[model samples]
Target: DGSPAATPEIRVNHEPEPAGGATPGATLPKSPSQLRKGPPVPPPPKHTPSKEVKQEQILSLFEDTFVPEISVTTPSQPAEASEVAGGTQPAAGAQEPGETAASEAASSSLPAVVVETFPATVNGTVEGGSGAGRLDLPPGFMFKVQAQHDYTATDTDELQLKAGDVVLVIPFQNPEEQDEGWLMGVKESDWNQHKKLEKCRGVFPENFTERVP
Candidate 1:
């Protein structure tokens, strides 16, 4: 018998790139859908209506307890009180009538100083007009000034100041329009006679007029 010799050849190939190096184990999923599941509980109903009903019941109870007492007792108390007040009022009026009558007489004379109402519109007739405006000064009237000398107006803006003429001094239409020695005024006699400020008001020298004390 003759035996033939056998030669064995083996080859090993190395990988070119590192693959599957980062994640070696199961890492990503902790799944929500498959694990914890139940039907959601329904939301509670509104409690406001029951709370308001309880408050209304207390209110009714209080009203029921107090309504009768208030209606019965207060009527008599107020009626008697009003009767006594009415009796005292007439008695007081009888004594006060005499004093009131005398005071009213004095009051009538003082109203002579009461000012007549001036119109709201500014007089367009003024010369060198910037802002000589607003008649609403102190309530009813501004103030009174007596002329110390007789001076006829050369300009339309100047007021005719006759000696003894009483002028009612007021603010300038434009407060800045008031000059150092000049004052805006209306003659009281003209105002009382004519009831107009359009032709009655003008600026006069403050030095030429005396302030009423």
Candidate 2:
């Protein structure tokens, strides 16, 4: 029987092939392709002219219109007032009554008398000399004399009348005699420098007026 053992046939099964010409056994996953790069972008837009911004600017301008305007004025200078009121004397121009032009002119015209020598005597009793005797001297004119030992050669000799020296004199309105009496033998120290003529202009008594030629 063995000699006739059936001759058994052996058949092999085949699998479907993968797509894209892949191998049939398990294969590794394919890597993906890199993405393409684009160019750089530009800056953003700047919006300047908005409606709200325009309205704000207009309101600011209107506020300034309500402010008041300022004015500047310069002050004027005051006028100089006159010292004298009104007087008709030509020399009285702008001068007071006591300071009339006539008076000033007369004063300017008076001769300038200076003592020429020392130890000189002013005879008060002499009609033409200084003091009560002088016709030009006003009434109540007194006599005064002073002495100076330090007289320089340049000093007026008339001013050097010393004390105890006899000088002619005239009395003010007669305390006893109506006519101014002539007085003699007056001491040099008894002479008055202020009321009597010595340095500057002499002042007359109340009843006296300056004599003019």
Candidate 3:
């Protein structure tokens, strides 16, 4: 009687479909618009510069890789690779001169820097005698002698004599040809030891040997 039954109709209407109508508009419209707009904005900005930078960076990386590999190959042992890539004229000229100079330096250093046994031929006549003009006895009188000291031959004209040797001394035909205290002789033992005489007649110092008879 007071509100004339109007509140009962209002409760019935609320229970039937109030929440369905309001919820459909509130949740559906907001979520759909938000999801659709978010994807479109990100795609436009991100793909524009991203693909271009990726392609450019990949090309730059390939060039960097090739440059380092070629540089390394040029210095280390790959001459043929350098010739093919950069041409033969520059690479061959540079490398050949380098190797040639190194080879020449090695050869020159070996010969000039290192020393070997030298044949000292001239400065070896220090065995001169104190006395002179004693052994030119005669031309035809040959005397048998024995060596008292060892005499090593320093020249082709000198005879190598050892102690206790049997040498037959034949005097020089010209007294002027004979040097002082030096005699022309040959060892008897060497003459008969082999079927052939290995040692030729040569001059020796007279004081190094004594008369045997």
Q: Which candidate is the best by lDDT?
A: 1
Q: Can you write out model 3's per-residue Cα lDDT over 1-213, one digit (the tens) per residue?
A: 455443433333344544433434344444323211111111123434433333333333333344353433445554443324655544434334333333333333343466678665566677866543323333354788898778676555456789878787875546665556677776765444323333355667677787888
Candidate 1, residue 178: lDDT:
61
CA lDDT of 205 in candidate 1? 75
Lowest summed-lDDT stretch of 10 residues in model 3?
34-43
Higher-scoring candidate on TM-score, 1 or 3 = 1
Candidate models: Cα lDDT each: 0.63, 0.35, 0.57
The reply for model 2, stretches above 4 Å from the true place, is 1-164, 175-186, 192-213
Among the numbered candidates, top TM-score falls to 1
Clashes (N, CA, C under 3 Å) per candidate: 7, 10, 0
Q: lDDT tens digits, residues 59-124, model 1?
A: 333333443544444443333333335443445343333433333333333334555877676656
Pairs of residues clashing in candidate 1: 131-173, 131-174, 132-173, 132-174, 133-172, 133-173, 133-174
Q: Give lDDT: candidate 3, residue 95.
A: 39
Q: After superposition, how far is residue 209 of candidate 2 from its true place, in Å?
A: 30
Tens digit of per-residue lDDT, candidate 2, span 1-213: 356556779999999976675556876899654321222223237736556433333333333456689999999887776566487746635655564454333334555766676575665664654553322443344544322222211122122223222332434333442222112112333344334443322111211111112
- Which should have the higher lDDT, number 1 or number 3? 1
lDDT of 2 at 132: 39
Among residues 3 or more apart in sequence or in different chains, the pairs in candidate 2 whose N, CA or C atoms overlap within 3 Å are 91-101, 92-101, 117-157, 117-158, 118-157, 118-158, 124-168, 144-191, 144-192, 145-191
- Please say which candidate is ahead in TM-score: 2 or 3: 3
TM-score, cand. 1 vs. native: 0.32
lDDT of 2 at 57: 38
